Amino acid sequence: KFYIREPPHGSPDWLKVGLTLGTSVFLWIYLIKQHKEDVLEYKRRNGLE
Amino acid sequence: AGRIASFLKNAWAKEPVLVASFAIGGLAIILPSLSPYTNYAIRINRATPYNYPVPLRDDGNMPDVPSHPQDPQGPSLEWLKNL
Amino acid sequence: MTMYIAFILSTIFVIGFVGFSSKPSPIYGGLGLIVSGGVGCGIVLNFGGSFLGLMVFLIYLGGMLVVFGYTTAMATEMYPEVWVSNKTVFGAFVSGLMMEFCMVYYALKEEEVEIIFKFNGLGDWVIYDTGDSGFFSEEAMGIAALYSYGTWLVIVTGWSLLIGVVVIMEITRGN
Amino acid sequence: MMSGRPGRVPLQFLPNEARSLPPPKLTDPRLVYMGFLGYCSGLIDNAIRRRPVVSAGLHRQLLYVTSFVFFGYYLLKRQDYMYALRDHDMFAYVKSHPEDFPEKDKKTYGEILEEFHPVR
Amino acid sequence: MPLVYMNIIMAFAIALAGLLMYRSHLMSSLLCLEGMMLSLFIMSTLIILNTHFTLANMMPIILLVFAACEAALGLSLLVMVSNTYGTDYVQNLNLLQC
Amino acid sequence: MNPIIYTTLIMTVMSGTMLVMISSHWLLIWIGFEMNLLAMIPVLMKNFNPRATEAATKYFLTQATASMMLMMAIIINLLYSGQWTITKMFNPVAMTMMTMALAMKLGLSPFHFWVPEVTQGISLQAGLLLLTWQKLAPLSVLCQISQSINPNLMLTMAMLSILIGGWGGLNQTQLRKIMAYSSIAHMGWMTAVLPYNTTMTILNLLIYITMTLAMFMLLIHSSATTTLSLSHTWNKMPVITSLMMVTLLSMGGLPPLSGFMPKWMIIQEMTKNESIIMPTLMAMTALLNLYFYMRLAYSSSLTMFPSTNNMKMKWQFEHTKQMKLLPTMIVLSTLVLPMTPALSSLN
Amino acid sequence: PFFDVQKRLGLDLDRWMTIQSAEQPHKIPGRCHAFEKEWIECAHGIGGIRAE
Amino acid sequence: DGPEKNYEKTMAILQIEAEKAELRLKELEVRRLMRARGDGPWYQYPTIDKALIDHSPKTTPDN
């Protein structure tokens, strides 16, 4: 509608948004799992635990 | 199937030199790995003593190294003679 | 006395270079380079570098051939320059002759020429090394080691020559 | 202050002995700013493409803020790592070289003779 | 350091002068440039043959292979300025001014 | 230009630089240098205009001479030490020779007249390539040999680099030319701290790099080559010209923007090492940069400039080439000062 | 080197030729093999500005 | 909050600051000493590895 040309981003590019959300989730859980294993490794390394 | 054979035939007719060169080249890489004598060529090259075999200081308990240049034990190249 | 030849081989190298760099007609600079390379092949050769000397002979006397190939194609004009055309070229040439002449005169008198680095005027025959080679030429064996130890060198070169033919294609393509 | 340190494995982001250091907290003020640093990248992106700046494609914003906060976290461990090492061989050099760091004697202000300057 | 080293170093110094101090010609200048690498090639071969640096024996040709490549493009560039401009005389070579 | 041919030119340039910063044998460093030289000449000739031929010819001559002097330094330290390993030089004149050989490739000393011209000749994308990627190799070599560089030589050379960088850009309207002069100034900036501690010149290299992409991508997002052409772009792209202005503020180093951090770091370490006179000279002369920076800002965003009637139909068309990384490219080049401690990561 | 991939990922790429006491083809020693062996094994893990 | 709050907080401020300042001065001194002498971890510039050399018998002796 309006513009007779089909808009370049006029449709929800489902695959790309899918990988963006999947990435962000991956980076997030990798981040917090990373932090947990660093803190546990630290305490068991320097004698805290 | 038919297309590949027809293309080979046309190449053998249209540019015969190209197919001959490509063939003999393609052999040139794949035979040396397949051939069972390249290891023998390595043996040829290692056999030639360009320098002196400087001896080892004898101290006992090297039965592998011959005591004399006429001794039986030690590296031998009778395969070289048969080759 | 042909003792000093290993010296003079370099000396004719120098003054054949100056006229080559005296900015003469392009072919006369080419002639200077040609005599310089021909006499420098002897310099490498009498030091034992037979293969490298003949190698530079071949490739370089092809390389100046090709730089000629455009000199008569993309560098000539109605009136090509002459090795006597410009007046300044004579001054450049003679300034080429007198500098190394004065320096070698000093090196023949004091043997401690102070120009740039430290140099002795006592010929060149000394710096050779006593020894032997068995039944193999050191230079040839070293340049043959390119295909056994020159792991990276041949790879990077061949890649560069491929890129070189590509760029030679692209720049001269003419749209 | 370092690249010639002994036992320094090249092209190695986070060395193994770094884990003995306290990992940066997930609520580290530097980390959260670099999370905010992600927002500025996202907000500008919509502006460049003249998209609705406030709410254009939150999917783009999510990776923009999550990737930046991630690469920030690993950088902070390395940041603390080098500062720890700089302070580590610090004391090792001082302890191993007592002569170069003499124990300066402490004297109270009752023993010094600082001269007061009348500021008129 | 004997007189052969002086001679090839001094040849390089005048090649530096000749190429870098342009007189009027681009082709002759890049000719001086490739003579430069000839001087360096001989110089390099000298120590390498002298000191029995067996591996380094392959460095000159390697050093050679790239250097001609430079000239391979140099003269190649020379034609590209030549067909439009007419000559290799670098004094009309002024269009790029500001 | 075949797309695949252009890609293979990309990666041979990048591999030529990679060979420089990963090799240890000196000959390999030279090889990478000319690989990059041989690879970057055709992309500079992508447009194929006589200005491009001029720029490519000047680049070729300058860089070929510089690489030949590089081999001269190479041969001399080989002759005086018989060691191809890249380390502290064992002959002084060899060190100096390598210094000017690399500098001609960097455009620091009077060996800098090539860069403004060659930048004028080529297209702006080739300009981004030239003024960003073709610095990493010579900087890396200079970093590897910082053990023995004549401090007087490097310091004066950086001083002229920044000084003629500031002065040359004043009387230039072509955005490519003023960018070349600004890059010369930044060249002097990092090379001044090169002898003292290479972490800070690495940091300044990173900041100058990110600023330069953030700059050039804005130019060819506005498609402008003259100051008046950019001034006409105050209309169509107001956001692009506002970001134009903010990064032009980051140019000089006005706090708290990113560009201030490298100046601050360089001056602080120069003062740590009793060089107190030296930093004040670039500190003053950065105002020379800020001058034509402010002129560009005034022409761009601060003052409205007279547009053109035809220009209005441009309003109907949108930039289709995305030119990715621009948002983060701006952001890293604008707000990273609260992250200054991260410099220790490079060390 | 700046980014020494050679010892990180574990192969020689150029270090074979760097010095002339390395394994030369068919054990052809250099002119100064003994002296440079002495020098290299003298200055190993010492630091350039200290080993010089 | 009571004066004890601000005052107790502020000597801690001063102690942290001073324990940073003398550290900075000692860092300048240590960095200078370790750039000059070099007998320590950092500022150690590279050298030649001893593993590259070869000890096996060569073609000619006394090399």
UniProtKB/Swiss-Prot annotation, chain C:
The gene is MT-ND6. Its main location: mitochondrion. It catalyses: a ubiquinone + NADH + 5 H(+)(in) = a ubiquinol + NAD(+) + 4 H(+)(out). Gene3D superfamilies: NADH-ubiquinone/plastoquinone oxidoreductase chain 6, subunit NuoJ. Belongs to the complex I subunit 6 family. Keywords: Electron transport, Membrane, Mitochondrion, Mitochondrion inner membrane, NAD, Respiratory chain, Translocase, Transmembrane, Transmembrane helix, Transport, Ubiquinone. It is found in: Mitochondrion inner membrane. One of its GO terms (cellular component) is mitochondrial inner membrane. Its EC number is 7.1.1.2. Core subunit of respiratory chain NADH dehydrogenase (Complex I) which is composed of 45 different subunits. Disulfide bonds: none annotated. It is an enzyme of class 7 (translocase). This is NADH-ubiquinone oxidoreductase chain 6. One of its GO terms (molecular function) is NADH dehydrogenase (ubiquinone) activity. Core subunit of the mitochondrial membrane respiratory chain NADH dehydrogenase (Complex I) which catalyzes electron transfer from NADH through the respiratory chain, using ubiquinone as an electron acceptor. Essential for the catalytic activity and assembly of complex I. It is a multi-pass membrane protein. PANTHER family: NADH UBIQUINONE OXIDOREDUCTASE SUBUNIT ND6 (PTHR11435), NADH-UBIQUINONE OXIDOREDUCTASE CHAIN 6 (PTHR11435:SF1). The keyword Ribosomal protein does not apply.
From Swiss-Prot, chain E:
Belongs to the complex I subunit 4L family. It catalyses: a ubiquinone + NADH + 5 H(+)(in) = a ubiquinol + NAD(+) + 4 H(+)(out). The chain crosses the membrane at residues 1-21, 29-49, 61-81. This is NADH-ubiquinone oxidoreductase chain 4L. GO terms for molecular function: NADH dehydrogenase (ubiquinone) activity. GO terms for biological process: ATP synthesis coupled electron transport. Keywords: Electron transport, Membrane, Mitochondrion, Mitochondrion inner membrane, NAD, Respiratory chain, Translocase, Transmembrane, Transmembrane helix, Transport, Ubiquinone. Its EC number is 7.1.1.2. The keyword Heme does not apply. Its main location: mitochondrion. InterPro entries: NADH_UbQ_OxRdtase_chain4L/K (IPR001133), NUOK/Mnh_C1-like (IPR039428). GO terms for cellular component: mitochondrial inner membrane; respiratory chain complex I. It comes from the Eukaryota. It is an enzyme of class 7 (translocase). Core subunit of respiratory chain NADH dehydrogenase (Complex I) which is composed of 45 different subunits. The keyword Transmembrane applies. It is a multi-pass membrane protein. It is found in: Mitochondrion inner membrane. Core subunit of the mitochondrial membrane respiratory chain NADH dehydrogenase (Complex I) which catalyzes electron transfer from NADH through the respiratory chain, using ubiquinone as an electron acceptor. Part of the enzyme membrane arm which is embedded in the lipid bilayer and involved in proton translocation.
Swiss-Prot record, chain F:
One of its GO terms (cellular component) is mitochondrial inner membrane. InterPro entries: Complex_I_Subunit_2, NADH_DH_su2_C, NADH_UbQ_OxRdtase_chain2, ND/Mrp_TM. It is an enzyme of class 7 (translocase). It holds the Pfam family NADH_dehy_S2_C. The keyword Metal-binding does not apply. It is found in: Mitochondrion inner membrane. It catalyses: a ubiquinone + NADH + 5 H(+)(in) = a ubiquinol + NAD(+) + 4 H(+)(out). One of its GO terms (molecular function) is NADH dehydrogenase (ubiquinone) activity. GO terms for biological process: mitochondrial electron transport, NADH to ubiquinone; mitochondrial respiratory chain complex I assembly; reactive oxygen species metabolic process. Keywords: Electron transport, Membrane, Mitochondrion, Mitochondrion inner membrane, NAD, Respiratory chain, Translocase, Transmembrane, Transmembrane helix, Transport, Ubiquinone. The chain crosses the membrane at residues 3-23, 25-45, 59-79, 89-109, 149-169, 178-198, 200-220, 237-257, 274-294, 325-345. Its EC number is 7.1.1.2. It is a multi-pass membrane protein. Its main location: mitochondrion. The keyword Cell membrane does not apply. Core subunit of respiratory chain NADH dehydrogenase (Complex I) which is composed of 45 different subunits. Interacts with TMEM242. Belongs to the complex I subunit 2 family. Core subunit of the mitochondrial membrane respiratory chain NADH dehydrogenase (Complex I) which catalyzes electron transfer from NADH through the respiratory chain, using ubiquinone as an electron acceptor. Essential for the catalytic activity and assembly of complex I. This is NADH-ubiquinone oxidoreductase chain 2.
